[PDB]
Chains A and B, each alone.
Chain A
Amino acid sequence: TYMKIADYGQLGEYTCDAKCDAEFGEPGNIRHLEGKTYDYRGVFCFNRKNLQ
């Protein structure tokens, strides 16, 4: 399990005099992730003499 910062987001910018519109802005996500693993699992067989 790992994390993936999707985005950072904006924070209210460059207001000279109070108009009170962009107070909090919007932040991004952290997006926890996962992932598994796999396997091969093969076999074979000879009898006793065709190998000897």
Chain B
Amino acid sequence: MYFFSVDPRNGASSCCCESISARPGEVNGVMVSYAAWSAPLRGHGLTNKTTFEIDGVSVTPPKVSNAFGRTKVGVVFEGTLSDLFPNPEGEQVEYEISELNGPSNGVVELGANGAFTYTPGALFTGVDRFWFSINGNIGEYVISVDPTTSELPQPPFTTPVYVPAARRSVDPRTHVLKFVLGVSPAAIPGDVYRLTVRQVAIDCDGNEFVHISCYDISIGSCG
């Protein structure tokens, strides 16, 4: 669990944005203590109006593309995994399905040449993924099983680094913010993304004291 003490903005307190190290696949929790900056500002403490943003300063675009799959409830799905790796050179295609990032409500049987059978779990409807690895380059294949009525929508292909929608909290009694930092198994080791957090306090009457700080999430292998 990461912990950070934010600068108090008092005129007295490598890069400037602090560093954060993550490993592909992990989902951690981060803490920051606004006690140094918000306690002198005597008021109603913090508010649940935090705003995050993700941008990468070095991406190294991925090799294999992603794809989408569609099928109704209960009916077995079939698909190909050879079009997802347009390779510049000529080399074999070592398709592999990691038992760690496989499906969650189904099973997949990897064929001999870029073929796989996704038999979704019976009495189940929703969306399901599984992370393949075409010769080292990891990508995700998303499948949504429709509840036989019309159709299901199209999920947004979760990013390398992400902060969940609603899993954060703040304790105005002690001025501590908590959130979750998730990194998909498709992140390439070596890249660095930048996370910016805009935290806003509130006075005794209902005005605002905003605060902005940055962090450099560095996706490195082996912790």
CA distance A50 to B204 in the complex (A): 90
Q: Is the interface of B mostly helix, strand, loop or mixed?
A: loop
What is the interface size of chain B, counting residues whose CB is below 8 A from a CB of the partner?
3
- CB-CB < 8 A to B44: which residues of A? 19
* CB of A5 within 8 Å of the partner chain: no
Distance to closest chain A CB from B171 (angstroms): 13
Chain A, 1-25, CB within 8 A of any chain B CB: 17, 19-21
Q: What residue in chain A is nearest B206 (Cβ atoms)?
A: A21
Binding site for A on B (CB under 8 A): 44, 173, 204
Q: What residue in chain A is nearest B43 (Cβ atoms)?
A: A19
CA distance A19 to B173 in the complex (A): 11
Q: Could you jot down 5 A-B contacts, CB within 8 Å? A: A17-B173, A19-B44, A19-B204, A20-B204, A21-B204
CA distance A19 to B203 in the complex (A): 11
- CB-CB < 8 A to B204: which residues of A? 19-21
CA distance A17 to B44 in the complex (A): 11
Distance to closest chain A CB from B199 (angstroms): 20
The 5 closest A-B pairs by CB, nearest first: A21-B204, A19-B44, A19-B204, A20-B204, A17-B173
Q: What residue in chain A is nearest B205 (Cβ atoms)?
A: A21
Q: What residue in chain A is nearest B44 (Cβ atoms)?
A: A19
Q: What residue in chain B is nearest A21 (Cβ atoms)?
A: B204
- CB-CB < 8 A to B173: which residues of A? 17
Distance to closest chain B CB from A49 (angstroms): 90
